[PDB]
Amino acid sequence: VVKVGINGFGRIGRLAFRRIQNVEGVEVTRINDLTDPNMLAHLLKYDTTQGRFDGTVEVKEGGFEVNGQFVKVSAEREPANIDWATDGVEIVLEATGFFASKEKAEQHIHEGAKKVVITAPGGNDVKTVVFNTNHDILDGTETVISGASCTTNCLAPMAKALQDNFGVKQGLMTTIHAYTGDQMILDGPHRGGDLRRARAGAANIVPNSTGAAKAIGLVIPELNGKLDGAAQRVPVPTGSVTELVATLEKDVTVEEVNAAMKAAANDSYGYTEDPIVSSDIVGISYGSLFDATQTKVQTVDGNQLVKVVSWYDNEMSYTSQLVRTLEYFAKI
Amino acid sequence: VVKVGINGFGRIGRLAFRRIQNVEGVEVTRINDLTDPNMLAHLLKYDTTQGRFDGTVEVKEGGFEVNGQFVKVSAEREPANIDWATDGVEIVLEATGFFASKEKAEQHIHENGAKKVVITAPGGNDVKTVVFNTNHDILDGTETVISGASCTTNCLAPMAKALQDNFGVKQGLMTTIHAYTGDQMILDGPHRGGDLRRARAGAANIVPNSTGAAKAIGLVIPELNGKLDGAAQRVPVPTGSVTELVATLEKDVTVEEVNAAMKAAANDSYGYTEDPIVSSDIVGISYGSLFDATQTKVQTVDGNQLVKVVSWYDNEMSYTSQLVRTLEYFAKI
């Protein structure tokens, strides 16, 4: 029974919680967010995209009581004074976004938590892990690691599969992504200065930058600098799809490509041949779901351009990955 | 030429600036906002619901150059620190929503600056609230700070008044199927105001919500004071709203009389149709309120009646048009 502690109860934090209620070896014994508990309890009970909470949530003095089981809920501002140990928390899921550094993160470790999985990007100190793609790089001596981004978790299994089977020369990625909470609901000043995220998110197709373009080299070394992309935010509250147009070190057919993805299938990387749409991936556990129906292999004058597509619930897919990385990193 | 100053370049502020461009005799010579001029310029040029700006917008030293005309853009945190006079501003449109009291608003008014102020919100105790063409005749010219009511009040006012002048209103409940607003979360998250419903994804839910238009209609129509109440259902539409009013009248009526009466009350602020229009059809209109005769109802049961009247409005542009009419009028009084 791996005891988890969540710091930051946003979309990712709350979904992390939910997902853990369905994973056997793991369970949350301590939550720490700055928001008013009644507010957090309501948001956990009612979710627009992920649906009602599977169970019951009742506010109590120390925290909540989820399905006849008390869960401590604190509102500590600094990792320093979060006595995770009192509740038996051995791993901490840092998802507030204010501790994206090796230093900030380590604060959770005193005696005190033992290991921390960061949601934000790593840097020199932190290793970036996309479960079932490169969690093998973890030896056990790590204290802080990153679960990478939602987009990386979708692109990795797919790109790795292209690399391992045919070898990738280079490629460009385009993600038709759902709008996120950092976009304006209506045209207004985006405190980040982004002239595009300042526009109404659910009323526009909004071009936007991506980090999974380069960061992909931190998960799949042989691809370092080989891939680049962008995104197109669209009016869907959750659910995304990644398109990778690549050039390979070997010629292929649609069937070969599709086959290789099926061969690479597991709990984190699924496979379909059903003509599905966005809504069909809301809430899945796969961090990425290859769509064989969208595969393309254009041949013109002996040269090929390969197109492979993968769907992913930018919310639950990403969360399922975080939860899998947690349970593993904790058992190391 | 009525010189206007805009404090707060948000949705209202920007649309107010836009409307003024098609109102001869009124010009905006200064905008005060804390946001980077470049961000503001961009938002004035490109608008999702109201369209591309009609003309040119350039960021120049000290402000903007819109259609060959210069507009100073300042970023003062304190109203008293805005020298509206140096730019010839005689009347300020308080559109930040941060100031809703006679005291706070009067700061604009001094010698280094403003002469008159129109706040875009319920203005407090010592402030008259005006819905153009409904009660602006109460302005004697001496007042310093006035209120232009709210977007919902401007829709409700002319409609309710027509019911009062023709039949007498005993009491009534109102429901506004309102477009979502910047006040709501784009995706489920902690709402800074603590509102558990505004905390929900605004463009993906029917969201029940309180309002005070019907409750403070007495500030516009004294005879209705305390006679009306309501709420709203926010829906996945970026702009455009409808206000339904169910009430009890003193005289018995027919669907025909209520509609005829509304039509007679029609003017530049209160429109009238019989076309089965829909919400997008009112986006950007100039009427502060548009009565819809196709949705009228007069239910008679055992001698007693319930009358249902409906009016459309662009919670953004309808309101804005009303604010400009009042600015111009108040300024010239």
Added chain:
Amino acid sequence: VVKVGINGFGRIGRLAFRRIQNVEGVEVTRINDLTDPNMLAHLLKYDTTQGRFDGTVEVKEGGFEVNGQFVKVSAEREPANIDWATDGVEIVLEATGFFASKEKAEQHIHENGAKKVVITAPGGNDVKTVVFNTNHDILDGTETVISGASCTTNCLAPMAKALQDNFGVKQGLMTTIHAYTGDQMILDGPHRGGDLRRARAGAANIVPNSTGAAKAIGLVIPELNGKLDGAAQRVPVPTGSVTELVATLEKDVTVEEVNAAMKAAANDSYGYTEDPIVSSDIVGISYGSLFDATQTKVQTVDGNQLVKVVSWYDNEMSYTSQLVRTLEYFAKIAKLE
């Protein structure tokens, strides 16, 4: 077990089918629809609003295999040519919309056919309209064809009923902030029914629309006959709706009084809540109506009162849940004509 047959595999038929998988004494053994089987199987496995099918669906020779069970799927144009008996179907759910009359509906009831039919269309003359847990007591079992009312009525009835039984209703006006439906155009175009409002883009407008719920509510609650009337405002939500009733009562009341009464009338078809929920929170619910105590208003002005009560409902699964609950009951109270 009540063996049900579905005729019309649209939103209603498919959801009735999913709901039945969670109801023990009922199962579907025959589906009849003019659509290519593969298309239907796909729409059953995947659903934009009600989610992924709970289990497995495969196209097989002559029908589907759903959760390890075979279900025959035919495409008979005429009810007369559907051997419902062959599959053990005792009760049929007529949801195609093309057999909304008693005479037309009875075509399912032949020798090698079904015994009882429940239409999803409105009823009226020789067809009783039934809103389970509100007026299913009007069924004696001898009836051949009955109606399960409309999505709107199954929401309104339990609420209006409580107001009547406890305080007495004089009159009232209803407005439903309703999700857009399949009869609306996805983009502005000629609506085949000639309706100028349903001709407009359903997911990009607040669209006024007329309902008959309030008018024919008397068919379900005789006392309220002619006492109610209403309409709707279709809004940009693929599913999930809310009904607001505004009425005058026989006696004075308080918010607590009204809410408490609604809570007292709560059961499986009529839930009660006090949480400031929102539209997406009732998508997929099995309640036929969910009273929201946070929206109640009792306005008292100069001695007179206007009472406002609001109930949420998934215009799809709530209605679907009520039909299944009516199918099962009608099937077992069933007496051979």
Added chain:
Amino acid sequence: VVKVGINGFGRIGRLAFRRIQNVEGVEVTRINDLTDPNMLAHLLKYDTTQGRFDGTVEVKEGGFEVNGQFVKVSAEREPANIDWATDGVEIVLEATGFFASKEKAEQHIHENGAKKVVITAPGGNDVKTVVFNTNHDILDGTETVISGASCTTNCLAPMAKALQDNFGVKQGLMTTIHAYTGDQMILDGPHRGGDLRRARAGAANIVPNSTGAAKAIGLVIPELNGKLDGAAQRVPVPTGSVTELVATLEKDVTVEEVNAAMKAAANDSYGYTEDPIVSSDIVGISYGSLFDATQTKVQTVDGNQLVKVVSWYDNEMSYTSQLVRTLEYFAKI
């Protein structure tokens, strides 16, 4: 001067009509549609995505009176029964989608018929495809029936030809993040064409969908025949689209070089922009395609380059604008 007749008053037809009201020397004198005139008149006046009609529309005996001018509105099912010649119709905009072939579209050519036809869909074998400002120079003026291509083709063409004429195109793959259209279901249900993806709620999903603009780009830009292939992702926006093209070129290039080439190729049909716009900012434009320099990508990995260019476009109005540009030229040619 040029009198146009419209057959099929759906989205394309009604927009062409509107667009022509703002085009000098072109007037619509005859409309033919099977739909009831009152429903058509209503759809012309009110439009969710393109806004209220610029003027007045009134139903009259045998037609409409638009902005004071009468227009004949008939409902003949067979093209042979439309006496276009009576109204002075010299050219016909065939948009019913039921005569997308030379011999069929030709049924419009007779005594009381027209002299030329422009179909709004891939025309067939003996029909030329035309994207104004990129290849209308192939019109000799003696053709009877021609095609204005598709909405995506009018977007992809100029951009694609700019790359060909400037650097030489090897191959490329297109992806259009497209607005949902009339052929998608508003809610999940059986799609008439058997398409399992178009059967899904188009205003509530990202919907992968096949296209043909890339595979048939050769009918407009010969050198590119068979070098391009694509697909689309329909998203929840009522109108407004953007085309992404990833290709390999004959020459090495830089971002600046590509953008500059695009700017140099700009004109009335092909726009250029460096502002970080969004889809709604594109609704209603007259460009057949608008290149966005802010989205250009030129990736260089070990000496090999992958170029990505992007163009916005209103799948409705951009394409409509192209159609009337072509209609006018063809008629005068």
